Amino acid sequence: DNQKALEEQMNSINSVNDKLNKGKGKLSLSMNGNQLKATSSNAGYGISYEDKNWGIFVNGEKVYTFNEKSTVGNISNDINKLNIKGPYIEIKQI
Incomplete structure (x- = not known):
């Protein structure tokens, strides 16, 4: 898994927006x-x-x-x- 969650601090928490951010509402x-x-x-x-x-x-x-x-x-x-606080947060669709 994500040992240090390094990738999470790269795209992850930014891309999480990119799913939500679609058009009508985001x-x-x-x-x-x-x-x-x-x-x-x-x-x-x-x-x-x-x-x-x-x-x-x-x-x-x-x-x-x-x-x-x-x-x-x-x-x-x-x-x-x-109030979604740390640590290691995986916000995505399922």
């Missing part, structure tokens, strides 16, 4: 030490009208499941509660 995530930062662009919209199952895996532990069915806006409202 999601963006960042960190600040032990801080979690999510943003939905277009403020409330979802992908379009499709279904997607997602997760966030701390060392291979899916701590949260969101669906692009849910507007990535309303989802980032959730990302504020869930």
Whole structure:
């Protein structure tokens, strides 16, 4: 697996946006030490009208499941509660 999560600090946490960032609505995530930062662009919209199952895996532990069915806006409202902190976070679709 990712021993040091070096690759995670390269593309990973940037590309995680690239799945979420599609059109109608999109999601963006960042960190600040032990801080979690999510943003939905277009403020409330979802992908379009499709279904997607997602997760966030701390060392291979899916701590949260969101669906692009849910507007990535309303989802980032959730990302504020869930407050996804380290370590090793794998945010991707499943």
